[PDB]
Amino acid sequence: KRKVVLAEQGSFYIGGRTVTGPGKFDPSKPVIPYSNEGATFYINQMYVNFQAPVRPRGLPLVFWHGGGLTGHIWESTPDGRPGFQTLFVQDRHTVYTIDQPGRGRGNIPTFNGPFGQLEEESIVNTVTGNSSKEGAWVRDRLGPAPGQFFENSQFPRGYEDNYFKEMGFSPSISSDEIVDAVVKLVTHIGPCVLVTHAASGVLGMRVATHAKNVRGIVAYEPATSIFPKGKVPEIPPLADKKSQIFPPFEIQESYFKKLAKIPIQFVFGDNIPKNPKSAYWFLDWWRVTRYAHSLSLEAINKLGGQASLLDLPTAGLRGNTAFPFTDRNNVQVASLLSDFLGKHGLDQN
Amino acid sequence: KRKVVLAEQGSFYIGGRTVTGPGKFDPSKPVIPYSNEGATFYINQMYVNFQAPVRPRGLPLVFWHGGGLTGHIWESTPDGRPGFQTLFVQDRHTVYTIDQPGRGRGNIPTFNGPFGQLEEESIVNTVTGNSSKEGAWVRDRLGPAPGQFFENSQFPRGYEDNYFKEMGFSPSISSDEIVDAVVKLVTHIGPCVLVTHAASGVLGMRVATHAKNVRGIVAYEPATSIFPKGKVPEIPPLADKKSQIFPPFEIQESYFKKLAKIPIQFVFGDNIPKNPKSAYWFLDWWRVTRYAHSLSLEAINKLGGQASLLDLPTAGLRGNTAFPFTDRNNVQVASLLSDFLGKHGLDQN
Ligand SMILES: COC(=O)c1ccccc1CS(=O)(=O)NC(=O)Nc1nc(OC)cc(OC)n1
C-alpha cells in the first residue's frame, strides 16, 4: 500500500519576475543587516515537485492545492495515510505537485521594510487576511459548527490539529501572476492534466484557456465559478438575504470556448444542503456555489464541451468534506479520478 | 543514478501552539471576509517530509535547511541533479527533510491585520528583512562580487535564477520555538542524525543539548558559533575594523557538555581567505566565522568531545560554495558524509 518506485524525483522553481531597489551594491560594505540598496529580488516564483514512476502511462498530473494550502495535501492525509501523489504514482502517472506563488515553498514577496513593501512600492499588501480554525472548520464542512462533525463524516477524526496546521495566509499576489506561473509550468511539462481544489479551481480554468497543453481538468470543490463576460446567469443571494457567493470570474467568450475542447469534471463532497440554511452561512454558501458551478458547466456544454459534475454521494461515497482527497475514503475518491482519466484516454500513451 | 525505491513516504505537521482572537465565532454570520473574532490560530508549526528505503540501515537523517531556505535544497540542485534526499535514500537511510517554522511549508504567523499582528499583540514583526540576490551571491561565496565566479567554482553556473529563487524572508519567530519544534520531531523519530546548514547550525547544536536522541551532527558552513555562558573567547572584528561576526550564542555549561557526547563535524567549502580581506566583506566574515567555529569545536573537545572541522579542499574537493550539497561535486560531498556516518557506526542497525 505504501511502497513507491520512482524512476526519478526532484523539485525546481519556475516563473516569477524581479524587482530592484535603489542604488548600487558595494561588496566591501557590511552586507548584514540586509539592505534594499543595489538589491535584486526574485519574486512570485513557484515551487514544483515531481515524481515519475518507472514506465509512466498517460499524461502527467499537476496537483494544485486550494487556498491557503500547499502540496502537502497531496502527499499525505492529516492522519498520515498516502495522498494522491503516492496513489497516482502507483497508478503509473508522473505526478507534479506545486506550491503556488505566495504559498509554502513558493515566493512570499517581501523585503527590508514593512511587509510586502519595497521602498515606496507596494508589491503586496502589508495588511494580511487569514482564516481561523473555526472559519476553516465550517468552510470545509467537517460539521455545521466548529468542534462538531456530521454523523457521516469522512474526516480523519482525532487529527484536527494536524489538519488545520497545514493552512495559512496568502499575500495579495495578483491572480494573473499565479496563472502566469502555472502556464509556464504547463509549457515546460507538455500535455498534462490539472487537478485543482477550492481556490485553484478558477485559476486552473484560466490556465486551460491560455495553455492548450492542458488536456483535462478535475476540480475538487472549486470556490469561484467562471462564465463568459456579460453572460453571468442570475444567481440568488444566500439565505441571510444579504450575503452573496464569490463574484463569478468573467473571461472573453473566445477564451471561454477553449474550455469546451477538453474533458472537465467538478467533484463535490457531501452535506451540501439542498434548501436554504440561514443558520449555517458556509453550508448555504456551498449550496449556491455548487449551483453556480452547475450553470458554468452547462454554459461550457452548450458551446460543445465535455463538462460534468460528480456528486460523490451519487457514486455511493457518503460524508466527504471539501477535501475529499484527504478524507478517510480517499482511495475510493482516487478510484473515481482514475476512472475519469481512463474514460478520456488520459491514462494511455 | 536517479531511481529510488521507497518503502513509504509522506509528510506531516508537528509542533507549534495556538493564539486566539477575542469574542465568539457565530456560524450564521458571514465567514468571509475572514475575521479574528472568536478565532483560534495555529502558529509556528513545522512541516516534515520523510522517505524511507526498503531495508533501512543505521539511523534516520534529518536534513535542516539554512536561513531563508526550505527542504527543496536537499531534494534537487538548482540544475536538477539529485539532492542529498535521493542520495541518502539510495544509501539506505530513512531521510527526513523539514521546512522549519516561518519557512516554506512551515507556518508564517499572521492574521487579519498588519503582518504578524493579532489585535494589539505583535506575534512577529511587521517589518521584514530579506537578502538580495547580490547579498546572497557574496554570502554563499559564488564569487567575490555579484556576477563573478571564483576560478575553481563548483557552483552550477547558468542556473543562478533557479538558485536564488529558492531563497526568501523569515518572520521574527523566536529561535526557542524553532528549536522546540525540532526537539519534538527528534522525540518522535527516535535516535537520529542532524545534518544542518548555515543558520540551522546553531539551532541543531541547541537541539542536541535538549535531545539525547541526536546521536551525531554534520553542519555545513554554520553561521553562528556557540560557547558556554561566560566563556566566549576573544574574537577579532572584521578587516574593516568595525564589523563583527554574528554574536556567539551562549548556553549553560551543563547543556554545552552534552555536545561532547556525540560526534560533531563542521564542513566548510572553498575560497574562505586566510588573511584579512577588507575589500570583500562577506569573505572576511567567513574567515572570522570559521575561526570562531574552530574555537567552539576546541571547547567541545576540551570537555571530552569528538568535534572536528573538515575543510573540503583538504579532502581534495576544490571550489565548493557555502552550499556544498548542491554544488556540481555534491556526490563527492555526500561520500564524505557517508564516511562520517560509517566511521561512527551511524549506518549500522
Ligand atoms: C480551501 O480554501 C479555499 O480555497 C476556499 C474554499 C471554499 C471557499 C473559499 C475558499 C477561498 S478563501 O476562503 O480563502 N477566500 C478568501 O480568502 N477570500 C476571498 N473572498 C472573495 O470575495 C470577494 C473572493 C476570493 O477569491 C479567491 N477570496
Ligand SMILES: COC(=O)c1ccccc1CS(=O)(=O)NC(=O)Nc1nc(OC)cc(OC)n1
Ligand atoms: C544560507 O543563509 C544563512 O543561513 C546565513 C549564512 C551565512 C551568514 C548568515 C546567514 C543568516 S542571515 O544572513 O539570514 N542573517 C540575518 O538575517 N541576520 C542575522 N543577524 C544576526 O546578527 C546581527 C544574527 C543572525 O542569526 C540569527 N541573523
